[PDB]
């Protein structure tokens, strides 16, 4: 039967199939090739993906996301204590493990992280099933190289709940290397720089006669595109207050409208130098109208961009690598489209050009789908 490829990411998933010799990264019901890893439990209905993320503004305690930060961990782990302080939905201690508590028709309902991940995997499965016109029972699913056996098993368990035999778990750096078609012959050292929506990962991946090994991995679990958006939000909230005596933080709907336009502006500024951010009646009777330049975008985030170099030094240190030992730098995640990111990496590596693919946001799912093709022969 068919084997699909799923990138089960912290903020977004992505599904691809290998069909007729091509990888097809599939569109969700709204025509997006990535789907927010969100599930909402509002008013007796369950939503998954973009419809769920839209519930976050008015129902923050019922909108579950970022479960990948909890899956396979213990409630008292330093990382989970930190995530409980950040996340708005209730996290409870079920026999030493974090569970998610929401209300369904007012009733307290408690989920394991793998049960929420299963709902995201089910939606990806359904996309593939309708694209292929066939039932899907098998998948390649990706994990971070740092995932321990409990974290990988919990991910496999989410697959089983979703009706997926996970026939292979592959690490995100291997998936990226397959997507970029990196030469499997002889010995090559690759830096995989993976800057996503919520998390930053960097890995030294050695490819030797077709065998993939991650020699070192480091990162920052709270550094991504969403942080760059927040820096811009903070600046424009302050400016709007100065100019209008309105603090937009006092209206959650106003913040949601602004956040949507800021995200688009950021993406625009990866190609142009100036963009307009416009919301009619951001509150009744008051329009929002600003220009954001690429230079101000970079100024607002430059310390965050330079923070991505601390993990790169650590993995070069762990592996005992000179910078020159890296043969190829490959960029994964849509945030790697930011020109300043590319410049800072190139300068760190004394002028070595990083390899950007055309669509770094889909590279992991693309590689998962290639792995699915390889396993079938
Ligand atoms: C959608 C994103 O904001 C998100 O934060 C992340 C998910 O990988 O990727 C970003 N992303 C996606 C595309 C993109 C862009 N052209 N310029 C900056 N960031 C970009
Ligand atoms: C908010 C203000 O009532 C302020 O209190 C007053 C004195 O500076 O003038 C208005 N103000 C301040 C700045 C500003 C602006 N850029 N566009 C409209 N109104 C503006």
Author numbering: 28 to 404
The authors write:
One class of druggable targets is the endoplasmic reticulum (ER) resident molecular heat shock chaperone GRP78, which is also referred to as Immunoglobulin Binding Protein (BiP), an HSP70-like stress response protein implicated in the cellular unfolded protein response (UPR). GRP78 is essential in the maintenance of ER homeostasis, where it facilitates proper protein folding, mitigating physiological and pathological damages that may cause an accumulation of misfolded proteins and ER stress. ATP hydrolysis and ADP/ATP exchange within the NBD of GRP78 play an essential role in the chaperone activity.
HP3 (7-Deaza-2′-C-methyladenosine) was used to assess how chemical modification at the 2′ hydroxyl group of the ribose sugar and the deaza-modified adenine moiety (i.e., N7 to C5) affect protein-ligand interactions at the ATP binding site of pfGRP78-NBD. It is evident that HP3 interacts with pfGRP78-NBD, but lacks hydrogen bonding with Arg364 due to the deaza substitution. In other nucleoside analogue-bound pfGRP78-NBD structures, a hydrogen bond is clear present between N7 and Arg364. Similarly, the HP3-bound structure of hGRP78-NBD shows no hydrogen bonding between hArg367 and HP3 either. In the HP3-bound structure of hGRP78-NBD, the N7 deaza substituent of HP3 is not involved in hydrogen binding, similar to that of pfGRP78-NBD. In addition, the 2′ methyl substituent of HP3 helps orient the 2′ hydroxyl group to form a hydrogen bond with hLys296 and has hydrophobic interactions with hGlu293 conserved in pfGRP78-NBD. The finding that the hydrogen bonding and hydrophobic contacts are conserved and indistinguishable between the P. falciparum and the human orthologue suggest that neither the deaza modification at the N7 position nor the 2′ methylation enhance selectivity for pfGRP78-NBD.
